[PDB]
């Protein structure tokens, strides 16, 4: 009459046991790169040490009470919902922390003179604590009175030998599907999802638009040079300056580069000076020493702007890929409820497939310490010191 449920329960808790110590070991990592290297110490690591620790108590916590929860024991209904509940904290947790990431680095792309006076480590801590106390109250939510409690399957109840007040501890007996589809999935995972997807396409765009203005702004600074070369008339060499002058100070939005502009738009006034006199000749040569500033200052600024904006765009990549394997290992267990839900004339999805599901969901708290590990050379020399020492 069917296999044993202990064969098919103990591939469930030895995997769930393998995932636990993998997603303690990995971001244990994190945290203890993060403490010792300095370099690590900015407010856009301090919301991935609050990834990281939700990661950690995947492990810890919510790993044992997803193996409490399989196995159907009697309980208070109440007790049982902390334990199903628990673990949309933390994923609750994770969301807000990869919504914080997201509008950091669009930030320091938008506004990088005004990144350092606004987003402050003690503003980032303040965010970080009022963000756990929602992922509580969202988490929970069902223990606030939107549960089955009220409703209870009595024959499944008596068959387990239930006393007053006890339930058979199925997570889909009291956590109701509503509440997982339309308010956990719909509107806690899925909006800020989409929202992350938002965040990153305008990182993005304004890398791509900033690196087309510094290379329009660069071309214009040649062209107009050849223009004043090819002039025979006094207001050709005029125009062109004016053209050149308007760049110049429009680009200048350390102190080597300040006063390096300071001598460009210096000369670009000399050559305009005689542009007005009449001195044909005499400005064309003004206008070429602005070659010898061009090489030994502009384009040396030119190229410490593109390597900047070229490292938010693989730093906002690899960040973008993190949102993604979130999505990637929670959207299942999510779409399969959107199924039980929506579909009651469907069979209930198998068993096996469940907790494949939920197996899935939980190798998420795995994966961000080795993206970390291939993406980002600080993270990975920091990992390399670590376990070559200790
Ligand atoms: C954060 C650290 C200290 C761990 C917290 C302790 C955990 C393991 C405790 C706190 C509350 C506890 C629950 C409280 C109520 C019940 C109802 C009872 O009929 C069965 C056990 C059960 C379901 C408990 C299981 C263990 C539990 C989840
Ligand atoms: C990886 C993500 C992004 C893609 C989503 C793929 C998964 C979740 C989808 C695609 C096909 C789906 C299955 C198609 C058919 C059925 C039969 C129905 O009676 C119950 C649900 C069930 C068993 C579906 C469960 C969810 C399912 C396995
Ligand atoms: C990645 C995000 C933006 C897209 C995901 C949209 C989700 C919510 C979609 C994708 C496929 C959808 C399902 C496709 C099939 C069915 C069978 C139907 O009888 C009821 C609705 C139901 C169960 C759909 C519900 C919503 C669903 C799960
Ligand atoms: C914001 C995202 C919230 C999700 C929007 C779901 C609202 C809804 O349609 O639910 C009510 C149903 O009972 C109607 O049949
Ligand atoms: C670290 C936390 C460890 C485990 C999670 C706690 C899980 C709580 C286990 C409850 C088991 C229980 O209550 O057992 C009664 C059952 O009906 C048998 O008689
Ligand atoms: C840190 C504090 C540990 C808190 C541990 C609190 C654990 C209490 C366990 C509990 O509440 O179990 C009683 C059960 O409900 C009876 O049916
Ligand atoms: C200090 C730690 C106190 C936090 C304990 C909260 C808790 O886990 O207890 C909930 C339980 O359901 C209550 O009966
Ligand atoms: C944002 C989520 C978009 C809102 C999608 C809500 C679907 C509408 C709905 O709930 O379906 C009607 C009814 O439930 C059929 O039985
Ligand atoms: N639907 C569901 N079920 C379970 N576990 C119970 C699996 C099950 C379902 C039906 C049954 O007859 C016996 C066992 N965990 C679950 N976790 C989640 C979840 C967490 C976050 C998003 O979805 N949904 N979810
Ligand atoms: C990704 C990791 C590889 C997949 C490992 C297989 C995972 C789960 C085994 C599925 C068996 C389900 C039996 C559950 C029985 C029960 O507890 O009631
Ligand atoms: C080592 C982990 C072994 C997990 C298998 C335990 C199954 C539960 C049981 O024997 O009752
Ligand atoms: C330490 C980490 C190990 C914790 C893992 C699993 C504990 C779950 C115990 C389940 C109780 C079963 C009660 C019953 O059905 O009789
Ligand atoms: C920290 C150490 C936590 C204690 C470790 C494991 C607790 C496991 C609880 C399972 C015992 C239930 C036994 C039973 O069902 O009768
Ligand atoms: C990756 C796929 C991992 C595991 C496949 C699960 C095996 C399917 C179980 C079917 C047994 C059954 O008929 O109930
Ligand atoms: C179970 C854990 C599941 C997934 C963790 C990701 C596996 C990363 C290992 C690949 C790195 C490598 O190529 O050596």
Redesign the pocket.
Known sequence: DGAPP?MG??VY??VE?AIAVLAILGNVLVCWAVWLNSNLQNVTNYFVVSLAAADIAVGVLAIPFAITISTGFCAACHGCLFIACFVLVLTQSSIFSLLAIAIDRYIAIRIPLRYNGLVTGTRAKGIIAICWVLSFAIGLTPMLGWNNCGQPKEGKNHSQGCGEGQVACLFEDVVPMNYMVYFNFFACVLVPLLLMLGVYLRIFLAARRQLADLEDNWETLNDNLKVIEKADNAAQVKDALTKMRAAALDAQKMKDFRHGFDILVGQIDDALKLANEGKVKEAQAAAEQLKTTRNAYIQKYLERARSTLQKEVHAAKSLAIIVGLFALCWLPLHIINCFTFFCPDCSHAPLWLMYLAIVLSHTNSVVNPFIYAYRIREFRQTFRKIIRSH
């Open positions: 202990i329960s103990s808790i030895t046991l």
